[PDB]
Amino acid sequence: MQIFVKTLTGKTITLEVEPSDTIENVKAKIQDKEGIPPDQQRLIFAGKQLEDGRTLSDYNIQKESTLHLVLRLRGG
C-alpha cells in the first residue's frame, strides 16, 4: 500500500505500508527515508494526532491517503 506524507511546504514523500502497520512502525519508515528521529515526529491525518499504538486501519487510512508530518522539538 502507498501513502503520502507532507513535509516541507509543497513537498511530499511516499511510503510503502500495510493496513496493519502501527504508527510507531510508520515513523520508523520516515526515519529510514528522511532521517527524522521517531520521537521528533508527530503525524496528522484528518485533523487528529496519530497515537503510536494504533494502526493505519484504526484511523481508516487507505491507499493514496495523505498524512502531514510535524516536527516536535525541544526548546533550548
Partner: protein, 87 residues
C-alpha cells in the same frame, strides 16, 4: 478524501493562530516546541528559530549575524518583553 485534507488544514490553521506551531522560516516544515526556552533548532535545516517572535533568530550568515532575525539584545533591547532566552 478532501474532507480529511480540509480537517488537517483547519487543525494546522488553529495551531498556527494559537502559537503552538510555526513554519521553519528556512525550509518551511511545520515545527512545534516541547518545553525549554524561547528557541529551537530545526532538525531539517539546522536554522535557529526564535520561538517568542515566531521567526528566525539570525540573518543569512547564521549564528552571530544580526543583519536579520529577531536581534535580541542588540543595543541592549530584548526581542520581545516576555523573552527569557531565545539564544
Amino acid at each position: 478524501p478532501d474532507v480529511a485534507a480540509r480537517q488537517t488544514t483547519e487543525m494546522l490553521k488553529v495551531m498556527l493562530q494559537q502559537g503552538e506551531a510555526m513554519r521553519c522560516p528556512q525550509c518551511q516544515i511545520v515545527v512545534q516546541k516541547k518545553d525549554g526556552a524561547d528557541w529551537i533548532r530545526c532538525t531539517v535545516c539546522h536554522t535557529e528559530i526564535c520561538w517568542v517572535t515566531k521567526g528566525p533568530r539570525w540573518g543569512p550568515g547564521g549564528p552571530g549575524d544580526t543583519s536579520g532575525g529577531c536581534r535580541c539584545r542588540v543595543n541592549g533591547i530584548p526581542c520581545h518583553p516576555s523573552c527569557q532566552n531565545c539564544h
